């Protein structure tokens, strides 16, 4: 068919600037391209078609250009509602294909992430289960990963990498690292640490007694 | 000229059709003798 | 995940972490200790499917163990030189009574 | 000028068929 | 306003088959041509099939033929979308998409509906196992042990982190003193105060 | 304009005669002798009576969405039984009749005297 | 009201308004005045010759001196093509036709059987 | 001018052609008939 | 058009059974 | 490459496009879109043919063309230029048409009366 | 690509900006000027293929005409009221004259 | 020990027993024809 | 789920994993992978068979585990804990077979005799 | 082990073919 | 042991009944 | 205990061979002089 | 099944820069990803299996670290050699599958186009056809379009963009834009121009006559 | 050294079938899995499908399962794999990837092959036409109407730009007083000079 | 050592006899009454006899790389064609003798007597 | 060299080392001194008794004195279980027992042949 892919899966930009996301085909699609937008929640909405004919109703601060293979999408003086997912249409030849998508984050304003350990809760170890979690919390940007320690020995076995999308009032990130462990495991060693590089490795630990 | 062709085919109908009828007034009138011979 | 087979005082033994279930063959005895589960002799040829459930390193990993002896005791060594001679003679004899009774008829 | 030729024209052998056909039962008898 | 608007979130076992509604308003239904599309495997949007409600043809690409059939109920104005026996794959977020009717106008969709989620598994809507998390100050919430995805955990009646799934129930992490996790799967409203 | 709003286009490729009021209304209803002969149709604003030789006679009236058009009295004269009595039509029809009676004459003759 | 009064004979074609039983006469065809000054004007009616499909065929207006043609109440729209010795055979006119046809021929077969009969 | 109509009228006059000279057949056979 | 060629078929059609009528006479009478 | 055919019953006009035999096709008339849910009735389209009632010559007689679905109308090479003149009970036959009509009913009356003539004997 | 057709001194022209290759049908005659074809007088009805070929601004985009004529100067109205009794008095008559032939054998 | 080799023995012993019955309801056949 | 089938005739040991009917399988041997080219020329597994010629008890038994091509070895739960003690001409048969074999044997021998009595008379 | 038992069934069935024997023998003479 | 005394029971069912059938045969005469 | 068995096993063996060996030397005999009466 | 994707289809880094490349899964592929290096000639290596194993022969300066869905191939030390296409592929379920790939280009001075218009050929003249051509020439970075001018009109129709990688001895981009016309349209024009935009629209131009 | 070697760049007029040779060399041939990978769509490689040299067997890609059909041959140590009914989107560059015997090790392919570039296409070796581009000094050469792509267009015996295609013949636009064009596609050799 | 490079693994849980060759070498060959038996099979450095109660009889060398070992002389007696001459057996062998050249001869005697 | 002779009788078992024809005896079982002081040593060969399989089966080494075992040139693996009046049944053994019987069993039918005849 004719696969139509986009140059960046993610990119950034701080309210006020104008951004361009590109679209690449496969063939010459002679001008057949749609841009779509993609609000978190779900709703999308078609915003220019035929590369450059804005959709009724779709304000004038988006632009289409583009001609044969490359193609682009100008967003100009980004606001906080203009923060979605943007896909990229084909209509030369059927089918058609969409790309990947590209998802709009606002630039902070780098911070720091605030490392939390917590022992397994009182009534996790009566059911038998231990599950020791990290809260990583509010550090643009989004390049982190999370290191487990079980008494200075690592531990890649039973994650949970569970992260937020930005926020609409700090655009911060936070994470969740859960490690599954039973009730015997738990007990058999004693310092459980979990290791954070926010771009060095920020350290905060407990102790089972 | 075609209008031409269109009455003298018109009043052509008519006569055949008259005749017609002359043919089938025969045909009753002669029809009637031959029963009555047979 | 390998579920253990252990054969001491010459009676197997399926050990595991949890209670073996039985799924089909020699059923065997429940000893005294759960979990542990003896399968007769080691020369009664034990055969069969057993299921032991995940430990505390292996979580909801069931594994199944078809444990399948061949020792046998009745296992007779065949030399296929007297095998045939002796039923190339079985039937020489019964052709010679056969021949018998036609001449008695 | 053409049909009308046509009719006098059939007119013309009607007559000459229905005498000819009359004329050879004549004959025939 | 013109208006599409689908049907809802459905839990379907395996093998099964369910079909997909999405009611059009506010237009012509006949008019217009009815995309279906598939967003699958976090963001892929895939184009499965159209169909002409006028004459009910129905177009197809060619790796979804033989998973949708597309019928359409011109009386209701509604539209449908049937899978075939559907398997783990077919779990995603289906939209219906109007376009236009002939060749001029139908290869680009100006109105979208809201989706529907399908989530074939093969599980039973278990109830919350809830956990308090202790050492302003951070403390937590975990809940576990929920099939069905919808949940709202809030906090003394924060950040929600997404559910996740490594065996076959679902956790979400609430973070922030009472927790609070309802339960609109089973039916459960389970309070739970953070102390040491 | 006089309220004159029905006029004609004739003289088609298609021999036919239409009728046009001129009024871009809904509703547009026609009148015969007095009574609507019928509501417009959807979408068209021309009545058409049909072919040109059909000759339609009669008093027809137009009304849209305003008061009825002053009507228009169309007479119409597409003559199709037609027929020129010139010497040589009749003479020919004349030859045909005495032909005609002359062999039924001849016939009946003959049946008369065999039976 | 009462529709114009309209009689065509041959070639020639006459035309009379009963709108107004006794008024000023003044005659327009496609808009244009007609009649008066072969073609003329009667005191009542509107004499035409050599009636043709294409030289006259249109709206015709009856109205009395000193008016315009919306005034005068219907438009007359008459085509026609004319010949010579030329007459429209309605069906009674047809059947006449028939009837005497028949009557005249069964008479002279019957008159020729009896003749021949002796 | 239009040949529609003048031809169906060619085409019933033709009809009656062929009725006229069956019908003349038919009263000569069967007049041979009542002499025979 | 149809022409007057459309009177002329059955006119010929009935001109050949006239011929073959008049040559059956010939060849009866006399011949 | 496979031709437009072209079938005339009367007042109806019946197009139809062989050359796409899969996929639904659409019409196009004079670069206008025609076929599908429209104020007119008289035109519609199913299969490969479009149904062209109450024909007329001065309205509906230029280019026509069919595409399937997936196809833009501008992409086209196979236009008909259909310009026709239709009436109500309308038919085209010629001089040998007819001679077969006369021809064919002299020799059925022919074998009836030879048929009748060999059954009485 | 639309190739012109063009209707002047009642016969039908197909015009194009470059030669004009026969398909199917109406052969027509080569007119003095290349590139157009005449098929003919309008009323004949023409009907043909043809193919004309790539303008300046279309480059090798052939396109493909089916011009297609019905003005039919053989068309007939038929009233069936009209061919029905026609076709039924033949139908009579050819009855009288069979019972004519069956009386006379 | 092991106990392939005598359980063939054993077969052997037994298919000679079979055969030396069968022998023997021969030979005494045999003996009685030879009276009769 | 389908259970291992173990075939042994004489020293040779076939072994078939019937689970993956589809796919080509794999096996592999106490966590070593057996079968395919190797300098061991005793075994060799085709279709969903391992054959092991040449079966060593002390050396050829233990676990046994068959998975299909696209699946790793690891993530397997149907063992098979074979351990058979091999020798040539080797059989298994209990006192009720040699007892139906004796058994017959008298009755094929008297339905011969009965047979040959009867055809002679 | 295929045990001594193997030596027993031939004798047990030519145990029985004797008492089949002897039991005909017995109802022949006398009884 | 036990195959000892299925040797010697088998001579003397053998001895037995090659007795028993020639007496058998005896007396039928 | 089972070597035993092997060698009263292996002992009925050879002696009951010849045993048959007697018995197929007398089946000759008889062979011979039934052919002579026969 | 198990898409992979990976975060940007290109990233640029200068000479003896750490750059890390990212690759995420459909699903949890449980550490079974390899990293693969294709030359722009056309070869291609394999880099690291198992998420972390070098493979052998192939220098420690690449890493590959990640758990679950999120992995990342780390080069240090970028030299020229390592300006490539760089795959990563899963092995957890089958089909085997590989992500987009990231082509590497090392960074250089912004600098500007020297835009070059050419009337066509002589020959091309008497053959009948008129290819104008454009030669935009090192003008890194890549952000550049071609807006084609005739007589004061745009015209967007025939338009071939021809574009090339990254030169081995400047790391510079060279374009080429053609118009293909007929020697009919070349001479019913005389102004003929074509526009460049290195990120302000440089100009160059030619007459007919 | 271990090494994987590919037959070369082949013409295949749309319906045919082709047929494509890796020949391994340096280690020993049936003691491992070779894959075949497709590299279409620009750069988008696809994992076509493995053949088990030793037993012959074959796994393949649900997609590719109608369009290719391993073979090998063990004798020459050479690996197939034949193209069934190539449409146009069957252009591409195919790699055959060596990998390990065992699940253990065959899901990584350490050893890869050159490629194999298969042009799906309705065209014949047209010779080139050669223009002159005139206004150091900015000077271009462009050559056009040759099908296959191999072409070497030097300067005096400097942007060699891609070939192109908009029709179905390629074009190379090069760059800079004589131009020279080898075409070792249809054996042209055409030199120009560049004067205004 | 002293060039003893043969030794023997017995009592196996399968009934056999297996001699090992104290070399891993290629083509270590035994030898057999002064000339060699055989070449060593690949990758496998053992000569295995057979099952044990076959009673293998001779004089056996081996030769890897080096020189030859010094050659090892294994004598068997797995004795399978053993039987006791103790008082049962000879007794019960010659009670049967006794009873069946009784039988016959009075078979014979029979025959005889009746021809 | 003439490898080592030995004899079994029942339960004895008696070697010798023809590789000396004349020298000092001495005897090693499993690489350990046995022999010499029931069990005891000759001066030419070995006189086993009470052999077992468990208890005495292995190498054996006949050397002179003052050599270790590698000198001595062939070591000697026995192994055997004895049972009480037991012997090995050869080929010609079992063929002498068959032809014995054979000739008996005819010569005693042929002399009661000839007894009854008369
Ligand atoms: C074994 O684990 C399985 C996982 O489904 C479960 O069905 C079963 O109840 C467990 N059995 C025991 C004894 O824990
Ligand atoms: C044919 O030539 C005319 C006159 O030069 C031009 O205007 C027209 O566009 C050309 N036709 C097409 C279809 O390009
Ligand atoms: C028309 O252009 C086509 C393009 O395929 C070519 O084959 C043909 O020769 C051209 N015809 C003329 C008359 O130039």
């Known amino acids: 068919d004719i696969q139509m892919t986009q140059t960046t899966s993610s990119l950034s930009a701080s309210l006020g600037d104008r951004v361009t996301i590109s679209c690449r085909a496969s063939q010459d699609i002679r001008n057949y391209l749609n841009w779509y937008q993609q609000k978190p929640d779900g709703t999308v909405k078609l915003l220019i078609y035929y590369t450059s004919r804005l959709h009724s109703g779709v304000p004038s601060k988006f632009s289409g250009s583009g001609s044969g293979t490359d193609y682009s999408l100008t967003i100009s003086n980004l606001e906080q509602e203009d923060i979605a997912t943007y896909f990229c249409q084909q209509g030369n030849t059927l089918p058609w294909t969409f790309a990947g998508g590209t998802k709009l984050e606002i630039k902070r304003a780098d911070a720091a992430p605030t490392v939390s350990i917590f022992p397994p809760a009182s009534e996790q170890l009566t059911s038998g289960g231990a599950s020791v979690v990290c809260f990583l919390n509010n550090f643009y940007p989004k390049s982190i990963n999370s290191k487990w320690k079980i008494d200075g020995s690592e ?49 905060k630990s407990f102790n089972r007694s | 000229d075609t209008l031409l062709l269109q009455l003298t085919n018109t009043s052509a109908y008519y006569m055949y059709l008259l005749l017609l009828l002359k043919s089938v007034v025969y045909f009753a009138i002669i029809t009637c003798c031959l029963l009555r011979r047979t | 995940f390998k579920i253990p087979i252990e054969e001491l005082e010459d009676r197997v033994f399926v050990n595991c972490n949890t209670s073996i279930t039985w799924v089909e063959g020699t059923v065997g005895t429940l000893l005294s200790d759960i979990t542990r589960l003896d399968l007769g002799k080691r020369i009664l040829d034990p055969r069969g499917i057993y299921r032991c459930n995940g430990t505390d390193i292996y979580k909801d990993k069931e594994s199944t163990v078809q444990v399948h002896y061949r020792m046998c005791q009745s296992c007779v060594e065949l030399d296929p030189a007297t095998v045939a001679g002796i039923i190339v003679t079985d039937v020489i004899a019964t052709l010679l009574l056969a021949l018998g009774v036609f001449c008695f008829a | 000028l053409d049909p009308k030729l046509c009719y006098l024209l059939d007119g013309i052998l009607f007559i000459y068929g229905v005498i000819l056909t009359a004329l050879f039962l004549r004959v025939k008898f | 306003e013109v208006q599409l608007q689908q049907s809802g979130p459905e839990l379907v076992k395996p093998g099964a ?50 998973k949708a059939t597309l019928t359409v109920d011109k009386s209701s104005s509604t539209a449908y979308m049937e ?4 398997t783990s794959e077919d779990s995603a977020v289906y939209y219906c998409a109007r376009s236009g009717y002939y060749g001029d106008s139908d290869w680009y969709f100006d109105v979208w509906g809201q989706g529907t989620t399908l989530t074939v598994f093969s599980a039973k809507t278990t109830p919350p196992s809830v956990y308090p998390l202790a050492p302003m100050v951070t403390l937590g919430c975990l809940v576990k042990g929920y099939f069905p995805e919808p949940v709202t955990v809030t906090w003394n009646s924060v950040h929600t982190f997404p559910a996740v799934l490594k065996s076959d129930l679902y956790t979400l992490s609430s973070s922030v003193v009472t927790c609070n996790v309802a339960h609109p799967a089973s039916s459960t409203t389970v309070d739970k105060k953070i102390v040491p | 304009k006089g309220n004159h709003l029905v006029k004609v286009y004739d003289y088609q490729e298609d021999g036919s005669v239409l009728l046009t009021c001129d009024a871009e209304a809904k509703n547009i209803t026609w009148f015969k002798d007095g009574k609507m002969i019928g509501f417009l149709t959807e979408d068209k604003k021309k009545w058409n009576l049909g072919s040109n030789a059909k000759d339609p006679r009669g008093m027809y009236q137009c009304k849209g969405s305003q008061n009825k058009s002053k009507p228009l009295q169309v007479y119409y004269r597409m003559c199709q039984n037609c027929i020129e009595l010139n010497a040589a039509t009749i003479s020919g029809f004349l030859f045909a009749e005495i032909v005609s009676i002359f062999v039924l004459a001849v016939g009946v003759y003959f049946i008369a005297g065999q039976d | 009201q009462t529709p114009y009064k309209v009689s065509i004979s041959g070639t020639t074609v006459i035309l009379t308004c009963p709108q107004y039983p006794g008024s000023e006469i003044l005659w327009q065809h496609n808009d244009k005045n007609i009649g008066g000054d072969n073609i003329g004007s009667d005191e009542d009616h509107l004499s035409l010759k050599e009636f043709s499909e294409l030289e006259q065929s249109g709206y015709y207006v009856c109205y009395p001196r000193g008016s315009k043609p919306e005034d005068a109440n219907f438009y007359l729209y008459l085509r026609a093509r004319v010949c010579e010795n030329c007459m429209e055979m309605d069906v009674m006119s047809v059947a006449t036709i028939v009837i005497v046809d028949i009557c005249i021929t069964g008479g002279l077969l019957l008159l020729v059987y009896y003749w021949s009969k002796n | 001018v239009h040949t529609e109509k003048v031809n169906m009228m060619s085409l019933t006059v033709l009809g009656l052609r062929m009725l006229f000279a069956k019908t003349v057949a038919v009263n000569f056979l069967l007049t041979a008939k009542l002499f025979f």
């Open chain 1, 155 to 203: 531990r890649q076995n039973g994650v949970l990498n569970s992260w937020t999308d930005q926020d609409s009032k700090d655009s911060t990130y936070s994470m969740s690292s859960t490690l599954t462990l039973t009730k015997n495991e738990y007990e058999r060693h004693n310092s459980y640490t979990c290791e954070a590089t926010h771009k060095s490795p920020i350290v």
């Open chain 5, 83 to 86: 899978l075939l026996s559907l």
């Open chain 5, 17 to 66: 088959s369910m079909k997909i509604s999405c009611k059009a308003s506010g237009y012509s239904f006949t008019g217009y041509t009815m995309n279906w599309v598939k967003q699958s495997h976090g963001k892929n949007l895939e184009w499965m099939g159209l169909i002409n409600p006028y004459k009910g043809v129905s177009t197809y690409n060619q790796k979804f033929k033989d």
